[PDB]
Design a protein around this ligand. Structure first.
Ligand SMILES: NS(=O)(=O)c1c(F)c(NCCCCO)c(S(=O)(=O)CCCO)c(NC2CCCCCCC2)c1F
Ligand SMILES: NS(=O)(=O)c1c(F)c(NCCCCO)c(S(=O)(=O)CCCO)c(NC2CCCCCCC2)c1F
Ligand SMILES: [Zn+2]
Ligand SMILES: [Zn+2]
Lengths: 261, 262
């Protein structure tokens, strides 16, 4: 029902999904005036991220992004509750304007952004149940820029051709998801915000790593050109591009940083 | 109730009552290199009748969303494919703790504030309201405002703010030369097809954003950011008129054309 373009684009989400017009909306611009060091922001530990090579994980095109399903034995340690993984997915721009991260830093978009979605499995039985509840979700965000070829990201990207159309699926053999994370994961931005897609629930604890990863210009072009938001037999195909939300106002609030220099 | 820039009636909800706010060609936008293209046909505009007589006076009104100055229809811009006559000017700004309230951004950066001088196609239409619902019915000039030196010209407006503090209030401003509000090198500008930045968000505006900003002082910005209320003088739930700018919009395949190549 919802899209990133045309009549059903982001300014219209609030019609069907009232939280998209509510409080605590993400993404935001991360800029100096609103950052504040917080010594409580100790390093997260990424447990069960080294997925069994003997297991397969489902990659899907759901018409909005490409998503990889993740097992609940994968979790973040270091928050008050255990947050167990549910899925990862990406956001990107287009070849004419290849700057499609969701979060910005000092007003600047990165080329793309990876989100690893987790839910509070101490309090809730599954992500769908957690998604509208207090302390429900935690998302890790990795900013992506163009640079050297990244073999780890290619463990996902090499399957994109098999998920070109909405509803298509592919199986991805387990690999170490921590390989998708940047250098010095101890350095991150932290704030309370929302899902960046409908229903936009304000239930996400965001962790945006300070440092970006790189992927090659060919990898970024593949991501931007491989997918459609329509079914294979749609007589009016639509490319899956520019699948990021514009930044939201963020007033009288701070983003906390784990770094001081 | 009535549309605002904050809370349940804020900009993500405008489309619920004003469908064009969720439609195509929306403004403002971020002006950045990937979407700019030089166009040598973008020749200089001519500002005609901008020198308003100091012996005449012009109505300043707080309309609940901004402060606007009414302008006479003998003021026009020449150089477009019709003559466009002025109707009003108004501003957008941030707040005292965050003076970063321009609408358009440049390479992801907000300016302190923004002036819009709204014109309508007087060759074709009898009034701006009629023009507002027609293709290229409106032409808006935008001036980006930076915190810097005191600006005596802008103070010709700002010195009257304590007299239009509440919605519906009106004051008179003696005429002055409106071209004094424009920046250096007006020949250098960005041009694109967009919309009103407020409900009803009509996609009927030819935008001209000048390349160079003007400066007003910190004290001028603070006055602008503290003087005004969105609400009537007797409202038991007053709302400060702050942060009256829309977030930038997706570009939806549009380019912005520049009169400068570098
Ligand atoms: N950016 S995000 O991390 O806030 C995020 C998403 F962007 C998206 N959209 C994918 C990105 C689109 C452009 O790249 C999804 S979804 O695909 O499940 C939505 C539609 C399902 O019919 C979720 N899923 C959450 C919210 C919805 C319900 C399920 C449980 C919790 C996780 C999510 F958390
Ligand atoms: N930013 S803008 O240039 O798109 C713009 C405005 F922002 C606004 N609102 C002031 C800005 C509020 C926040 O600073 C106005 S208005 O006040 O006349 C009427 C609306 C309620 O306010 C017009 N004027 C046009 C609107 C439509 C029809 C009537 C005739 C004049 C043209 C306009 F073109
Ligand atoms: Zn996401
Ligand atoms: Zn305006």
């Amino acid at each position: 029902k919802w899209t990133y373009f045309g009549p059903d684009g982001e300014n219209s989400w609030s019609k069907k999904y009232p939280s998209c017009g509510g409080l605590l909306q993400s993404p935001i611009d991360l800029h100096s005036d609103i950052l504040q060091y917080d010594a409580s922001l100790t390093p997260l530990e990424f447990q069960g991220y080294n997925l069994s090579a003997n297991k397969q994980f489902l990659l899907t095109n759901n018409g909005h992004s490409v998503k990889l399903n993740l097992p609940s034995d994968m979790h973040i340690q270091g928050l008050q509750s255990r947050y167990s993984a549910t899925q990862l997915h990406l956001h990107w721009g287009n070849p004419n304007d290849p700057h499609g991260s969701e979060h910005t830093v000092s007003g600047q978009h990165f080329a793309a952004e990876l989100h690893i979605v987790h839910y509070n499995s101490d309090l809730y039985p599954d992500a769908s149940t957690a998604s509208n509840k207090s302390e429900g979700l935690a998302v890790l965000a990795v900013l992506i820029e163009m640079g050297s070829f990244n073999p780890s990201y290619d463990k996902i990207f090499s399957h994109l051709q098999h998920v070109k159309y909405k509803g298509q699926e592919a199986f991805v053999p387990g690999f170490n998801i921590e390989e998708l994370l940047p250098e010095r994961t101890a350095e991150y931005y932290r704030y309370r915000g929302s899902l960046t897609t409908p229903p936009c629930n304000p239930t996400v604890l965001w962790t945006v790593f300070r440092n970006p990863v790189q992927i090659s210009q060919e990898q970024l072009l593949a991501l931007e050109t491989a997918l459609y938001c329509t079914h294979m037999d749609d007589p009016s195909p639509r490319e899956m591009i520019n699948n990021f939300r514009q930044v939201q106002k963020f007033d009288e609030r701070l983003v906390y940083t784990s770094f001081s220099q």
